[PDB]
C-alpha cells in the first residue's frame, strides 16, 4: 500500500477505503490505491478526492475494476473474465448502504440479483431466465416473503387457509397489495380494498371492516383492528414481527 | 437536487441564545456533511461546524463562543445554537452541504443566508419620505424620483416600486449606520410622459418591525 | 488553524484582459484547496476543488494553478459576468479556513453622472426634520465628490453618502447624498445646492433649488 506520509486515506461506501497521493505523479495525476478482498487495485486521477477508476487482476486472471463516483457517493466493483469484457459479478454500493449485487452466467447475463435497501431489507432474485422471469424473495426484519418475478413486477405471496395475500412491487418501486379468498361461506369469506394513497389494505368479513394492514415506507407491516361493529379503528397499530402473525391476520 | 434555506430572527440581544434552522429539500440529511458558515460584516468567512452520519458533529475550536448542532431527520432539518451571543456574532449565517459524501471537501450547495444582528438596540421602523423634483423646470424626456428610508434599526428593508411605465431604471443605495440608526434610499427613472400622468409608488417593508409603508410620489 | 492569505482585497481589470488571483496557506496544504465566486446578494459558489479541478458549471476561461510558489485562480479573458469576489479555502486540516477574498471591478468608458436634487418632504418637515437629497446616477470611474452649499456657503455636517455596487450590466456606479438639518435651520435659508465633482469635467455639475419658490 502507500505511506501515511505520502498519502491521504479516504473512506468510501461499503466500508471501503482508498489512498490518494499527496503529490501528483510524473504525469501530473494523483495515484490511487485500494485493497479489495486481498487484491490491491491501482489507478490515477486528475483529481485528489479519491474518485476515479482502480484496477487489478486476480490470480485466476479475472480483471477487477473499481469505479469511485465523483462525489464519493457510489462505488461500482466489477469482476470480468480474463477477456476484460464478460462480467462474472458486479456490485454497486451507495453511500446510504443500499446496493445492487448481480451474479452473471457463462455468457455474461445476470442470473441472480440482490437489491439491498438502506434500511437493510432485501429483494433477492435467482433463476433469472432470459425472458426476465425468475424466483423472488423479500428479506425483511423478522420474516421472509416469497414469490416470483416477471419483466413487469415482483409478487410476494402469503397463504393461510383459502386466503391468498399478494404484494406486488413494480420496477419503479410501486407497491400494491391484494387479497383473494376462495371461501364460499359469505359469512366467513375475506374481502379487501387497497388504498394506494395510504398504502393500506382494509379487510372485510360479513359486511364488517375487520383490520387495516399498513405497508410502511420503512418496509414493515402493521395491523390494527376495527371495533365490534366494524366502523372505526380501535387501539393502536401493532407492527408485524413474524410471518405467522401475517397468517394470523389472514385467518 | 438539494435546496437549503436558513431561518431565524434578524435581531438577538447580547447574552441571549441564537437559534437558526436549515430546512433541506431534495435530499435527506442522513448522508453527507451539513455545515454552518457565517459571513462577518467585513466580508470575512468562517466555518462554524457540521453534523453528519448518525448525528455525529464537529465544531470549529477557534470560535469565540461555543455552539451546538442537532438535527431532525424526520423533518429533514438541522439546527444551529449559540448561547450567550456577543455583538461580534453579528453576521450572515449560511447552511451548506459539503461537496463529497466522505473525506474533506469544499461546500458545494449553499442556502441564501440570513442576516442576524446581535445588538441591545431597540427595533425601530423606518420613516419613509418621497423624493420628488424640486426645481423650476418641467422634466425633459425622463424623470428621476426616489424614496428616503430613514432612522430604522435592524437592517434590511425592501423598497419596491410601482409605476405606469413597464420600463424603468432602479437604484437601491446601500444602508449605512450613523448614530445607531440606519438610513437608505432608492431611485427610479421613468419616461416623463408617464409620471405626473401615471402614479408611481414606493413600498417599503421592514420585516423586523412588521411594517410596510407605501409612499405615492407627488 | 492554517491562515489563508489573499493579499489583494480588490483589483480593476479591463474587459477581455487576463486576471490572476493569488492565495497563500500558512503551511503546506497539498492542493486540498477550494475556490468560490461570490456575487452581491448571492451565496458563494464552489468554482474549483483540489486547487485545479474546475466544477462543471465553470466556463473554460477559468483555471487554477499548483505549479507556482502559492496558489492562483486565473481568467484568460475577463467577461462582465465575472465581476465578483473570489475566496480560496483550505480543507487539508481542521478547521477549514478561508482567504480574505479578492474583489474584481471591470473598467469601462468614463461617464459623467446624471444629477438630481430633492427638497425635504412635507411629511419630514412636519416631524421637525429636513433632509435634502442628491442622486448622482450612472457614472464611472467610482471616485466622486459632492459639496453641499447652503446660501452659497459649504456645509460639512449632517452628510450620508452611499455608493451602489458596480452595475452588473452597464458597469457604472451611482451615489446618494443626503444632507440632514433641523426644520428650524432649514427655514433659515433659501438656496440649497449640491455640486458634483467628477473626473469627466473641470466644472462641477451643480443642482439647486430655492426654498421660497412654493
Amino acid at each position: 500500500s502507500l505511506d501515511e506520509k505520502n498519502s491521504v486515506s479516504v473512506d468510501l461506501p461499503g466500508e471501503m477505503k482508498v489512498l490518494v497521493s499527496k503529490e501528483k505523479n510524473k504525469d501530473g495525476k494523483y495515484d490511487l490505491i485500494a485493497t479489495v478482498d486481498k487484491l490491491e487495485l491501482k489507478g490515477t486521477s486528475d483529481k485528489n478526492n479519491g474518485s476515479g477508476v482502480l484496477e487489478g487482476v486476480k490470480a485466476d486472471k479475472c480483471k477487477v475494476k473499481l469505479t469511485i463516483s465523483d462525489d464519493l457517493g457510489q462505488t461500482t466493483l466489477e469482476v470480468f473474465k480474463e477477456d476484460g469484457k464478460t462480467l462474472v459479478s458486479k456490485k454497486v454500493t451507495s453511500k446510504d448502504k443500499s446496493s445492487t449485487e448481480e451474479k452473471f452466467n457463462e455468457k455474461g447475463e445476470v442470473s441472480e440479483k440482490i437489491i439491498t435497501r438502506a434500511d437493510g431489507t432485501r429483494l433477492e432474485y435467482t433463476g433469472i431466465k432470459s425472458d426476465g422471469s425468475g424466483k423472488a424473495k423479500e428479506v425483511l426484519k423478522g420474516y421472509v416473503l416469497e414469490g416470483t418475478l416477471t419483466a413487469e413486477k415482483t409478487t410476494l405471496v402469503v397463504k393461510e387457509g383459502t386466503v391468498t395475500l399478494s404484494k406486488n412491487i413494480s420496477k419503479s418501486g410501486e407497491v400494491s397489495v391484494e387479497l383473494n379468498d376462495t371461501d364460499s361461506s359469505a359469512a366467513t369469506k375475506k374481502t379487501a380494498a387497497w388504498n394506494s394513497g395510504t398504502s393500506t389494505l382494509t379487510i372485510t368479513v360479513n359486511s364488517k371492516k375487520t383490520k387495516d394492514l399498513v405497508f410502511t415506507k420503512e418496509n414493515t407491516i402493521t395491523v390494527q383492528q376495527y371495533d365490534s361493529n366494524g366502523t372505526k379503528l380501535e387501539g393502536s397499530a401493532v407492527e408485524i414481527t413474524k410471518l405467522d402473525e401475517i397468517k394470523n391476520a389472514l385467518k | 437536487e438539494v435546496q437549503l434555506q436558513e431561518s431565524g430572527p434578524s435581531l438577538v440581544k447580547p447574552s441571549q441564545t441564537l437559534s437558526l434552522t436549515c430546512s433541506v429539500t431534495g435530499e435527506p440529511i442522513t448522508s453527507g456533511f451539513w455545515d454552518w458558515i457565517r459571513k462577518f460584516p467585513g466580508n470575512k468567512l468562517e466555518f462554524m461546524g457540521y453534523i453528519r452520519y448518525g448525528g455525529g458533529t464537529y465544531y470549529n475550536p477557534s470560535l469565540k463562543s461555543p455552539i451546538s448542532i442537532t438535527r431532525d431527520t424526520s423533518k429533514n432539518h438541522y439546527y444551529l445554537q449559540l448561547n450567550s451571543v456577543v455583538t461580534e456574532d453579528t453576521a450572515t449565517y449560511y447552511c451548506a452541504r459539503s461537496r463529497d459524501y466522505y473525506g474533506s471537501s469544499g461546500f458545494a450547495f449553499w442556502g441564501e443566508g440570513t442576516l442576524v444582528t446581535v445588538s441591545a438596540a431597540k427595533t425601530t421602523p423606518p420613516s419613509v419620505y418621497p423624493l420628488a423634483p424640486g426645481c423650476g423646470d418641467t422634466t425633459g424626456s425622463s424623470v428621476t424620483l426616489g424614496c428616503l428610508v430613514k432612522g430604522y434599526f435592524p437592517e434590511s428593508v425592501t423598497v419596491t416600486w410601482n409605476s405606469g411605465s413597464l420600463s424603468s431604471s432602479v437604484h437601491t443605495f446601500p444602508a449605512l449606520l450613523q448614530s445607531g440608526l440606519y438610513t437608505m434610499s432608492s431611485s427610479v427613472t421613468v419616461p416623463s410622459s408617464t409620471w405626473p400622468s401615471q402614479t408611481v409608488t414606493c413600498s417599503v417593508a421592514h420585516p423586523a418591525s412588521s411594517t410596510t409603508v407605501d409612499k405615492k410620489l407627488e | 488553524d492554517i491562515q489563508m492569505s489573499q493579499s489583494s482585497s480588490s483589483f480593476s481589470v479591463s474587459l477581455g484582459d487576463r486576471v490572476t488571483i493569488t492565495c497563500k496557506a500558512s503551511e503546506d496544504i497539498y492542493s486540498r484547496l477550494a475556490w468560490y465566486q461570490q456575487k452581491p446578494g448571492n451565496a458563494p459558489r464552489l468554482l474549483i476543488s483540489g486547487a485545479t479541478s474546475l466544477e462543471t458549471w465553470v466556463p473554460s476561461r477559468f483555471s487554477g494553478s499548483d505549479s507556482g510558489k502559492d496558489y492562483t485562480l486565473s481568467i484568460t479573458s475577463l467577461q462582465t459576468e465575472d465581476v465578483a469576489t473570489y475566496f480560496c479555502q483550505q480543507y487539508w486540516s481542521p478547521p477549514p479556513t478561508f482567504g480574505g477574498g479578492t474583489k474584481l471591478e471591470i473598467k469601462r468608458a468614463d461617464a459623467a453622472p446624471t444629477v438630481s436634487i430633492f427638497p425635504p418632504s412635507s411629511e419630514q418637515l412636519t416631524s421637525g426634520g429636513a433632509s435634502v437629497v442628491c442622486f448622482l446616477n450612472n457614472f464611472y470611474p467610482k471616485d466622486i465628490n459632492v459639496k453641499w452649499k447652503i446660501d452659497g456657503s459649504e456645509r460639512q455636517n449632517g452628510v450620508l453618502n452611499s455608493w451602489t455596487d458596480q452595475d452588473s450590466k452597464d458597469s457604472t456606479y451611482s451615489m446618494s447624498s443626503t444632507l440632514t438639518l433641523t426644520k428650524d435651520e432649514y427655514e433659515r435659508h433659501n438656496s440649497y445646492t449640491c455640486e458634483a465633482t467628477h473626473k469627466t469635467s473641470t466644472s462641477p455639475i451643480v443642482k439647486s433649488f430655492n426654498r421660497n419658490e412654493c
Side-chain angles (χ1 to χ4, degrees):
Chain A
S1 319
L2 280 176
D3 192 5
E4 304 182 334
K5 320 172 187 183
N6 302 28
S7 48
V8 185
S9 179
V10 186
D11 286 339
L12 298 167
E15 285 279 82
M16 281 193 203
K17 291 175 189 285
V18 57
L19 300 181
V20 189
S21 57
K22 285 186 179 184
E23 321 285 356
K24 280 177 277 188
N25 65 19
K26 297 185 178 180
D27 310 282
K29 304 293 187 184
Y30 292 85
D31 294 321
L32 299 169
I33 292 188
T35 306
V36 188
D37 184 39
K38 290 113 176 176
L39 187 79
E40 276 187 27
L41 310 178
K42 294 178 160 182
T44 60
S45 179
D46 52 301
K47 306 170 101 296
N48 61 19
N49 67 334
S51 61
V53 179
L54 293 89
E55 292 159 303
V57 180
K58 295 189 166 199
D60 63 14
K61 296 178 177 188
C62 281
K63 279 58 190 172
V64 177
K65 191 187 178 181
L66 173 66
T67 305
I68 299 166
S69 67
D70 185 67
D71 62 17
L72 308 183
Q74 179 189 89
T75 58
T76 306
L77 185 73
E78 301 168 298
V79 182
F80 308 84
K81 294 179 170 185
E82 65 176 290
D83 68 343
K85 292 185 179 304
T86 307
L87 275 169
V88 178
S89 52
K90 175 177 173 178
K91 184 177 190 179
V92 179
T93 313
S94 174
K95 78 292 187 179
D96 64 16
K97 301 180 179 184
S98 67
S99 68
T100 301
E101 185 167 358
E102 300 173 299
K103 178 182 171 185
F104 299 69
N105 63 26
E106 214 266 285
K107 74 172 184 67
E109 170 222 304
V110 184
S111 53
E112 304 197 334
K113 183 178 188 174
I114 299 195
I115 303 182
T116 303
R117 305 197 182 101
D119 65 358
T121 60
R122 287 179 266 114
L123 275 171
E124 307 189 321
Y125 305 107
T126 66
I128 301 175
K129 303 306 170 198
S130 320
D131 69 327
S133 53
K135 176 180 185 176
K137 287 183 187 173
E138 189 174 22
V139 185
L140 303 158
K141 303 312 167 185
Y143 54 107
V144 174
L145 303 183
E146 288 176 16
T148 66
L149 159 78
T150 64
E152 55 182 333
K153 80 268 170 298
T154 304
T155 302
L156 304 139
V157 180
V158 177
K159 299 195 174 187
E160 171 61 33
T162 48
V163 175
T164 298
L165 177 78
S166 311
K167 179 187 168 181
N168 311 296
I169 304 182
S170 66
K171 276 302 169 186
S172 303
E174 184 184 21
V175 174
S176 70
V177 179
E178 57 188 82
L179 177 155
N180 168 251
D181 192 352
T182 63
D183 194 337
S184 42
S185 178
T188 48
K189 185 199 186 181
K190 261 61 70 177
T191 259
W194 175 247
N195 190 326
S196 41
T198 61
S199 291
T200 178
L201 185 78
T202 300
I203 300 175
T204 295
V205 181
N206 188 34
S207 296
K208 286 185 181 175
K209 290 169 192 179
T210 56
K211 313 164 179 182
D212 263 8
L213 283 172
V214 184
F215 299 75
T216 77
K217 286 289 179 177
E218 292 80 54
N219 304 123
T220 55
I221 298 168
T222 70
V223 195
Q224 189 172 6
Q225 322 291 313
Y226 279 81
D227 63 88
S228 302
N229 290 350
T231 49
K232 183 181 180 174
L233 288 163
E234 287 198 324
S236 306
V238 179
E239 186 176 289
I240 293 298
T241 291
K242 294 298 186 173
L243 183 61
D244 282 320
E245 297 174 355
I246 300 186
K247 295 181 175 184
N248 271 307
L250 295 173
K251 295 187 174 181
Chain B
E1 183 180 295
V2 254
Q3 301 268 255
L4 296 283
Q5 184 165 42
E6 306 83 0
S7 67
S10 47
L11 183 56
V12 49
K13 289 169 182 166
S15 81
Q16 301 316 315
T17 299
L18 167 51
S19 305
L20 294 161
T21 291
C22 175
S23 306
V24 47
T25 53
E27 176 187 347
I29 59 178
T30 29
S31 293
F33 302 82
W34 306 87
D35 325 82
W36 281 107
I37 297 132
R38 76 219 294 206
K39 180 185 188 54
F40 296 112
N43 212 234
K44 173 191 171 179
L45 292 175
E46 183 187 79
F47 168 81
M48 295 181 82
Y50 67 63
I51 192 156
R52 40 114 70 87
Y53 182 81
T57 62
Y58 167 66
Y59 307 130
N60 184 346
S62 307
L63 297 178
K64 180 187 185 173
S65 302
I67 66 168
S68 62
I69 300 178
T70 59
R71 78 197 210 292
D72 189 327
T73 61
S74 179
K75 286 186 173 189
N76 210 52
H77 293 2
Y78 68 100
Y79 317 88
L80 166 70
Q81 181 167 276
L82 171 47
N83 295 336
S84 311
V85 292
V86 304
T87 50
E88 300 308 278
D89 290 316
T90 293
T92 302
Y93 289 71
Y94 294 95
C95 51
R97 199 257 281 163
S98 298
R99 196 215 146 144
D100 306 336
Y101 291 100
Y102 300 88
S104 309
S105 62
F107 310 109
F109 299 95
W110 299 64
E112 85 224 301
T114 41
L115 173 58
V116 182
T117 305
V118 180
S119 164
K122 187 177 177 184
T123 296
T124 304
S127 296
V128 58
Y129 306 125
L131 304 181
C135 48
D137 288 72
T138 45
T139 33
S141 294
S142 59
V143 294
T144 302
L145 298 163
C147 273
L148 188 59
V149 180
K150 191 173 180 190
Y152 64 92
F153 172 58
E155 243 270 74
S156 295
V157 286
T158 287
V159 178
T160 289
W161 291 97
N162 302 280
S163 54
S165 188
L166 287 169
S167 65
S168 57
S169 184
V170 171
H171 276 109
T172 307
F173 296 99
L176 300 177
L177 195 77
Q178 283 197 339
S179 296
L181 284 176
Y182 284 100
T183 295
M184 147 277 219
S185 56
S186 180
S187 74
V188 174
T189 306
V190 293
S192 304
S193 49
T194 59
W195 167 47
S197 50
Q198 303 167 46
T199 305
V200 182
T201 310
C202 74
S203 180
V204 186
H206 187 228
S209 57
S210 297
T211 53
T212 301
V213 186
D214 302 60
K215 273 291 131 72
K216 166 205 171 179
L217 275 291
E218 193 73 307
Chain C
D1 286 38
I2 299 180
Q3 318 309 327
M4 299 309 289
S5 171
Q6 293 182 253
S7 74
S8 173
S9 298
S10 62
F11 290 117
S12 181
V13 194
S14 295
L15 173 60
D17 218 335
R18 164 169 272 303
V19 187
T20 302
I21 304 176
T22 294
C23 165
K24 305 185 172 193
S26 53
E27 64 179 87
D28 219 321
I29 60 169
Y30 307 96
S31 295
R32 272 60 177 179
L33 175 83
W35 281 96
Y36 301 85
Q37 178 187 248
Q38 180 169 47
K39 300 196 173 186
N42 300 269
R45 192 171 187 188
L46 184 61
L47 197 159
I48 283 169
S49 272
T52 63
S53 174
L54 284 186
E55 296 289 294
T56 54
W57 71 269
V58 197
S60 287
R61 85 196 70 121
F62 289 79
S63 61
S65 180
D66 267 7
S67 47
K69 171 197 167 191
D70 304 300
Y71 296 102
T72 54
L73 171 65
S74 301
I75 302 175
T76 55
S77 185
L78 184 87
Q79 294 310 304
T80 308
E81 72 193 81
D82 304 341
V83 170
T85 292
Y86 297 85
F87 291 97
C88 65
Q89 176 242 320
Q90 69 86 23
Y91 49 83
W92 175 244
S93 57
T97 48
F98 298 76
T102 298
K103 178 186 188 174
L104 290 184
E105 181 227 80
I106 207 172
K107 298 187 197 299
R108 53 141 295 141
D110 288 351
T114 304
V115 185
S116 305
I117 197 169
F118 304 90
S121 63
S122 297
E123 184 191 343
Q124 187 180 28
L125 287 168
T126 295
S127 67
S131 295
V132 194
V133 188
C134 276
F135 285 142
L136 290 63
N137 295 135
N138 303 97
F139 61 88
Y140 187 96
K142 191 180 180 180
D143 207 7
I144 198 159
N145 180 76
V146 183
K147 186 167 178 174
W148 283 96
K149 295 181 173 178
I150 303 184
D151 274 342
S153 204
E154 175 170 28
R155 196 66 167 60
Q156 287 197 289
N157 274 281
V159 185
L160 175 74
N161 295 327
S162 181
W163 277 255
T164 49
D165 274 303
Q166 187 166 46
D167 194 272
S168 59
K169 293 159 298 185
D170 69 13
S171 300
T172 56
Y173 293 94
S174 291
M175 193 264 257
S176 182
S177 184
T178 314
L179 171 67
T180 304
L181 308 168
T182 55
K183 183 190 168 188
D184 291 332
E185 175 152 28
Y186 175 70
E187 308 196 320
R188 300 204 286 240
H189 303 93
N190 199 42
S191 199
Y192 287 84
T193 300
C194 80
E195 314 194 321
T197 301
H198 192 59
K199 175 176 191 292
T200 46
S201 185
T202 40
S203 310
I205 294 180
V206 179
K207 294 279 181 157
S208 51
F209 67 89
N210 287 293
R211 181 208 140 64
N212 272 322
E213 294 279 81
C214 35

